[PDB]
Structures are given as structure tokens and as C-alpha cells.
Amino acid sequence: GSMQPMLNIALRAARSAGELIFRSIERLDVISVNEKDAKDYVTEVDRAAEQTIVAALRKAYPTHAIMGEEGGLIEGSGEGADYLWVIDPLDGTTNFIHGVPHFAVSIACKYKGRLEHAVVLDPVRQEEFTASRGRGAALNGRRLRVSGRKSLEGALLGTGFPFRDNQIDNLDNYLNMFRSLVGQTAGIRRAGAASLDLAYVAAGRYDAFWEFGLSEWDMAAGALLVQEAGGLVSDFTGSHEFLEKGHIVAGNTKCFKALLTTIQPHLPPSLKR
Amino acid sequence: GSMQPMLNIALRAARSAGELIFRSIERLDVISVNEKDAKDYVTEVDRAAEQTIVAALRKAYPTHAIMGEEGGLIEGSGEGADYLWVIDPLDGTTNFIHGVPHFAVSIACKYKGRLEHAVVLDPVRQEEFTASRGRGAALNGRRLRVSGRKSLEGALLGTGFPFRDNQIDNLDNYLNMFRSLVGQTAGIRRAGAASLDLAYVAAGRYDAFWEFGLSEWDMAAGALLVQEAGGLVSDFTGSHEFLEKGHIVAGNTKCFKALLTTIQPHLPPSLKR
Ligand SMILES: O=P([O-])([O-])O[C@H]1[C@H](O)[C@H](O)[C@@H](O)[C@H](O)[C@H]1O
Ligand SMILES: O=P([O-])([O-])O[C@H]1[C@H](O)[C@H](O)[C@@H](O)[C@H](O)[C@H]1O
Ligand SMILES: [Ca+2]
Ligand SMILES: [Ca+2]
Ligand SMILES: [Ca+2]
Numbered sequence: 262g263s264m265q266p267m268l269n270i271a272l273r274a275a276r277s278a279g280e281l282i283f284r285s286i287e288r289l290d291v292i293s294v295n296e297k298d299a300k301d302y303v304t305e306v307d308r309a310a311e312q313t314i315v316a317a318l319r320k321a322y323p324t325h326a327i328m329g330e331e332g333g334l335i336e337g338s339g340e341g342a343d344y345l346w347v348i349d350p351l352d353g354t355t356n357f358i359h360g361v362p363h364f365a366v367s368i369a370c371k372y373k374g375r376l377e378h379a380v381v382l383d384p385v386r387q388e389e390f391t392a393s394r395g396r397g398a399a400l401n402g403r404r405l406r407v408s409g410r411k412s413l414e415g416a417l418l419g420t421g422f423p424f425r426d427n428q429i430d431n432l433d434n435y436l437n438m439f440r441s442l443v444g445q446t447a448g449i450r451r452a453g454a455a456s457l458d459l460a461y462v463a464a465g466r467y468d469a470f471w472e473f474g475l476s477e478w479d480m481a482a483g484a485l486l487v488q489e490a491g492g493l494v495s496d497f498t499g500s501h502e503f504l505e506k507g508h509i510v511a512g513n514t515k516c517f518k519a520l521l522t523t524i525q526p527h528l529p530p531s532l533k534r
Numbered sequence: 535g536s537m538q539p540m541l542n543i544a545l546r547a548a549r550s551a552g553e554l555i556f557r558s559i560e561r562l563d564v565i566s567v568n569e570k571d572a573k574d575y576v577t578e579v580d581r582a583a584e585q586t587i588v589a590a591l592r593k594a595y596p597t598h599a600i601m602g603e604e605g606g607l608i609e610g611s612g613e614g615a616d617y618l619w620v621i622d623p624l625d626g627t628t629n630f631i632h633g634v635p636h637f638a639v640s641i642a643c644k645y646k647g648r649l650e651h652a653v654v655l656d657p658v659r660q661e662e663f664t665a666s667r668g669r670g671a672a673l674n675g676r677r678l679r680v681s682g683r684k685s686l687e688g689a690l691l692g693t694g695f696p697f698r699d700n701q702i703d704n705l706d707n708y709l710n711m712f713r714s715l716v717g718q719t720a721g722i723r724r725a726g727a728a729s730l731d732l733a734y735v736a737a738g739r740y741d742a743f744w745e746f747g748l749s750e751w752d753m754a755a756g757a758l759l760v761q762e763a764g765g766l767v768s769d770f771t772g773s774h775e776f777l778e779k780g781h782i783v784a785g786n787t788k789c790f791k792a793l794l795t796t797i798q799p800h801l802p803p804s805l806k807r
């Protein structure tokens with residue numbers, strides 16, 4: 262079957278931004294590395310990709326609300342006000358600036374606050390993860406399902422490191438989580454792009470994933486992908502506010518629950534709210 | 535063209551093995567891999583890729599010695615006895631068997647025990663890292679240089695987690711190492727194929743890399759890549775027995791030096807000085 266029109270618009274915007282990013286990494290040097298925060302980089306490439314995405318989206322839907330990582334939140338109008346696009350124009354910026362070919366464009370659409378459409382596009386490997394609510398998820402058109410692994414034994418987990426200065430107070434907490442997972446699992450991977458970690462959970466390439474400190478645009482599309490592939494997503498307390506709180510556990514049925522339980526004893530009260 | 539004939543032979547062998555591995559991953563992605571069947575699938579693909587490589591190598595140099603991960607060590611004859619091929623037919627097998635598209639073929643040639651030729655091939659992204667002693671290193675034909683970063687400030691490091699049972703007593707040491715690096719660096723990455731981690735050091739994509747528990751076929755090609763790109767490679771004590779001891783630091787000049795210094799306080803004072 263073919264995609265709903267809105268998912269199609271999102272996918273074409275993602276493709277255009279990804280071709281810009283790929284042209285950059287392939288043949289150019291980065292000519293702008295500003296710094297939004299410490300270790301939080303913004304490039305001419307991030308802004309150009311964001312402008313590409315927003316131009317396509319507003320060409321199709323001028324009354325929708327837009328929340329871009331670089332541009333912030335801009336409300337819509339009329340009926341269009343119930344639609345909110347959540348855009349990471351380039352997820353994996355540190356990878357990108359170093360030339361590490363692992364990063365993605367991430368675009369989600371929420372209707373009345375509920376995830377409705379999702380695109381995660383890796384323009385190097387040309388991998389297009391798409392999903393719509395109640396429609397399943399797909400990689401380049403083929404339907405995705407979370408893995409069948411029944412426990413953490415032999416699992417391949419994805420994760421993200423608490424690298425920011427303002428996370429130092431939780432670093433040891435995280436390293437304890439990590440520690441208790443090394444024995445049973447087959448491996449833990451930190452490839453450096455949260456949207457692709459979620460997409461990999463959705464495709465069955467990772468059995469589960471956990472990270473704190475994330476922003477909404479990092480997670481929105483990938484969370485819809487995981488949900489539509491038959492998986493589970495929550496925050497560190499098991500509730501549905503992972504987008505607002507920035508801590509997230511995603512995974513297949515049993516590995517999600519097992520990882521959530523496993524991280525429980527190493528949670529600071531700041532991540533138990 | 536510019537490659538010495540021995541390097542070109544190794545490159546074509548890597549290409550054929552990588553095409554085989556790529557078709558294999560494509561077929562495993564559309565079927566459910568039993569946990570009992572995963573090891574058998576991996577042994578199959580491993581041995582088929584090794585056969586591909588070894589047939590191609592011996593068609594050109596039948597008197598050379600061969601050392602494959604799957605097949606062990608087989609001596610050569612005549613002057614060919616001074617040539618030893620060190621082959622990992624599939625670096626990143628846990629990724630592979632989970633469908634994570636990050637893995638590579640690794641082929642090195644040693645002449646009287648010194649690294650002479652090297653190929654690391656990513657068959658998904660189609661990235662061919664090549665080097666010969668005294669000839670420099672290339673990615674798909676373009677010359678490679680290690681990065682110029684002067685310290686670990688803002689550095690992107692590669693690493694490999696100590697996931698094996700026999701590394702358990704080192705786990706804490708590793709997590710101590712890791713911890714001391716979080717403040718300065720912009721990120722740490724564990725993508726799951728040590729040959730590609732070394733190749734990324736050589737291309738300037740990582741500023742430095744460290745890991746222990748490796749085997750010779752994991753490191754041989756990538757170490758030559760780093761050296762020929764202008765970088766530095768050593769074991770944890772700073773000597774050049776990384777191939778034999780299994781622990782390795784590689785980097786650009788300054789980040790190699792800083793990373794080696796950083797890891798010294800977390801070394802068991804004995805075998806590792
Ligand atoms: O900065 P960015 O590259 O857009 O987005 C994120 C990346 O997905 C990274 O994998 C994650 O670990 C960081 O927490 C985020 O910053
Ligand atoms: O078994 P393999 O996948 O061929 O090689 C792996 C090594 O065993 C190493 O321990 C791991 O950290 C690397 O990511 C891979 O190179
Ligand atoms: Ca960011
Ligand atoms: Ca991101
Ligand atoms: Ca971003």
C-alpha cells in the first residue's frame with residue numbers, strides 16, 4: 262500500500278534535506294561550527310537542512326505548527342493548529358562534523374499531541390524508515406517488526422552516553438546501569454544518532470534502547486517507529502512522558518520491560534520524577 | 535593503478551567477500567533468525583567469505599602463508615614463506631547477525647612480520663580503506679590523513695566495550711578509563727567493528743581509539759591504515775606489540791599520546807606496565 266499524503270510530504274522533505282547533508286559530507290568541508298551549548302554544535306548544514314524541510318512542509322501545509330531544533334516552536338493557525346511537526350534536521354551532528362557516516366534526518370508529525378507520522382532517513386545508507394499511526398512501520402517500503410528476543414540474554418542493546426557537563430551528576434548512575442547489563446547481553450552499541458537507535462529497535466536490529474537527556478525532536482519519529490513495529494516506548498518510570506522528560510526506554514516486548522526493570526535501582530530521584 | 539599488485543589482489547578479494555556478505559545480510563533481513571540458528575548462520579557466512587578471500591589470494595600467491603580467523607595458520611614455502619596474510623572475513627559479526635549495517639572485511643599482509651599491505655572494506659557503505667607500507671592510505675582512492683586536533687578537548691573517540699566473560703575483572707578498570715574521558719571529549723562511540731574504528735582513526739573521523747581483548751586479524755589492517763595516514767599505534771604500555779597482546783591505542787599524534795597517558799593509571803600493574 263501507498264503512504265498517506267502527509268507521510269509522503271514528510272518523506273520527500275526528509276529526502277531533500279538528506280541529499281543536501283550528503284552532498285556536504287561527500288564533497289565539502291563544514292564552513293560553520295557554532296556552539297549552541299557546550300558540546301551542542303550547530304552547523305550551516307543543520308540550518309540549511311532545516312530550511313529545506315520547513316519549506317517543503319509549509320508548501321504543503323502553511324497552517325501547521327512547526328518545532329524545529331534550530332528554529333524553535335512556531336504555532337499554526339485554524340484547523341492546522343492541531344498539527345505539530347517535530348524536526349531534527351540533522352541528528353548525529355558530532356558524527357557529521359567529524360565525518361563519521363552515521364546520522365539521520367528525523368521528522369515527526371503529531372495531531373492533537375499524539376504521534377501521527379514519522380520519518381527517519383539515513384542518507385548515506387539511503388535507508389528510509391517511515392510510519393503512520395495504526396499503519397505499521399517500514400524500511401524502504403518493507404514492513405518492520407521488533408525482534409522476538411525473550412530476554413536480555415544475548416541481546417544487542419543501543420544506548421546514548423551522558424556526555425554533557427550538566428549530566429556529570431548522573432554519569433556514575435549511568436555507568437552503573439551499563440555495568441549491570443554487560444554480563445547477560447551480547448553487546449551494547451553507541452553509534453551516535455538517537456533517531457537511528459530507535460529506528461534500529463523498530464527494525465529488530467536492536468532489542469532495546471535507553472538514554473536520558475534527549476530532546477523531543479531526537480525521539481518523536483523513532484518512538485512512533487518503535488510503536489508501529491510492535492514495540493514499547495516509555496520514560497524511565499514507565500509512563501508516556503518520554504518526549505517531555507527526555508529519558509526513554511524503547512524495545513521489543515520482553516527486552517523493554519527487562520531493561521526498564523534493570524535500570525530502576527540505578528535511577529537518581531531526578532530521573533524518577 | 536597506483537596500488538602495488540599485492541594490494542590490488544587483496545582489494546579485489548575484499549570486494550568479492552564483501553559482496554557475498556552484503557547479499558547474505560539482505561537475505562537474513564527478510565527472515566526470522568532463531569537464536570540457536572544465529573551462530574550457524576554466522577559460521578556459514580564467515581567461512582564462505584574466508585573461502586572467497588583465500589581462493590583469490592592463493593590464485594596469485596600460492597606460496598604465501600595464510601592466517602584466517604576461521605581457518606587458523608597455514609605456512610608458506612620458498613620466499614613466499616616470508617608473506618603472511620592475516621584475514622578477518624567478517625569483522626562485526628554481532629552487528630551482522632542482528633542486521634546492524636556496520637561491519638567490514640579486514641585483510642593485512644605482513645612481510646617478515648612487518649605490516650606491508652592493508653584493506654578494510656565496508657561493503658554496505660562501499661568504503662574501501664587501503665594502505666601499503668611507505669605508500670600512504672586511501673579511502674576509495676583519495677589520500678587519508680589523521681585529524682589535526684591538538685588535544686582531547688572536543689575529541690571524538692572510538693572504543694570497544696569489554697563484553698566477554700573473561701574481561702569481567704577488567705570491566706571496572708574500563709569504566710574508570712571511560713569515565714575520565716567524558717569531560718573533555720565531545721563524544722565516545724562504540725559502533726561494533728574494530729577494523730572500522732581503526733580505519734576511522736586513519737581517515738580523521740575518530741581522533742583516537744582504544745580497546746583490549748582484540749585478536750590480530752581485528753587490528754592488523756587498521757593499524758597499518760593509521761600508521762600510513764600519519765597516526766600512532768601502540769599497546770597499553772606504549773610498545774609496538776599490540777598485535778600479539780590484544781590491547782591497542784591508536785590515534786592522531788596528540789590524542790594518541792593523551793589517551794595513552796589517560797589509560798596508564800587504570801592498568802593492572804603487572805603484565806600491563
Ligand atoms: O545533537 P544531535 O546530534 O542533534 O542529537 C542527539 C544524538 O542523537 C546523539 O546520539 C544523542 O546521544 C545526543 O544526546 C543528542 O544530542
Ligand atoms: O568478532 P568480530 O565481530 O569479528 O570482532 C569484534 C571483536 O571481537 C571486538 O571485541 C569488538 O569490540 C569489535 O567491535 C569487533 O571487531
Ligand atoms: Ca542537537
Ligand atoms: Ca538528534
Ligand atoms: Ca540535530
Ligand SMILES: [Ca+2]
Binds near residue numbers: 624627
Ligand atoms: Ca570476525
Ligand SMILES: [Ca+2]
Binds near residue numbers: 625626728752
Ligand atoms: Ca573481528
Ligand SMILES: [Cl-]
Binds near residue numbers: 448449695
Ligand atoms: Cl559490546
Ligand SMILES: [Cl-]
Binds near residue numbers: 422424722
Ligand atoms: Cl557521547
